Amino acid sequence: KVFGRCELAAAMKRHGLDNYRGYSLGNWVCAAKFESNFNTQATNRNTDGSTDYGILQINSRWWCNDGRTPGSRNLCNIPCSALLSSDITASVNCAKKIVSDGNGMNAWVAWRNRCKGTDVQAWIRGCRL
């Protein structure tokens, strides 16, 4: 599913991401936009053979099992395919573990490079939340 901006904001809000670990909703919308263009089915392969999955491009090296990232972990305890669902619950629950691990949203490269220090509230402007 390709989410609309406001639709996704509202889904993330319902799933407890607004202000989660001090990150306002705009940060999460901004990250999703630049990681996946709001497409739950996005995949991208990394140089080391790991793959990033879903709306927030969660990486099989640490977070999910895809059966082809030898020596990787599965810290969210999920198959990576669950991260591609039109229901973002699994992505959101896994993202909460990532953002809690000490590095905050810096785990998401596109967030660090395209959202951090910008006016992220613009991403939820106009939305009925």
Contact residues for Cl ion (CB under 5 A)?
Answer: 69, 104
CB of 86 to Cl ion, least distance (A): 25
CB of 80 to Cl ion, least distance (A): 9
CB of 105 to Cl ion, least distance (A): 7
Q: Pick between residue 37 and residue 77 the one whose CB is nearest to Cl ion.
A: 77
Is residue 87 part of the annotated active site? The answer reads no
- Cα dihedral 99/104/105/106 (nearest 10): -130
Look up residue 25 and give its amino acid: L
Catalytic residue among 7, 18, 35, 87: 35
Which distant-in-sequence residues (6+ apart) come within 8 Å of 85 by Cβ? 40, 54, 91
Q: Pick between residue 3 and residue 80 the one whose CB is nearest to Cl ion.
A: 80
C-alpha to C-alpha distance for 88 and 58, rounded to whole angstroms = 12
C-alpha to C-alpha distance for 115 and 105, rounded to whole angstroms = 10
Is residue 35 part of the annotated active site? The answer reads yes
- Residues annotated within a binding site: 101
- Residues annotated within a binding site for substrate: 101
Catalytic residue among 52, 66, 87, 119: 52
C-alpha to C-alpha distance for 13 and 26, rounded to whole angstroms = 10
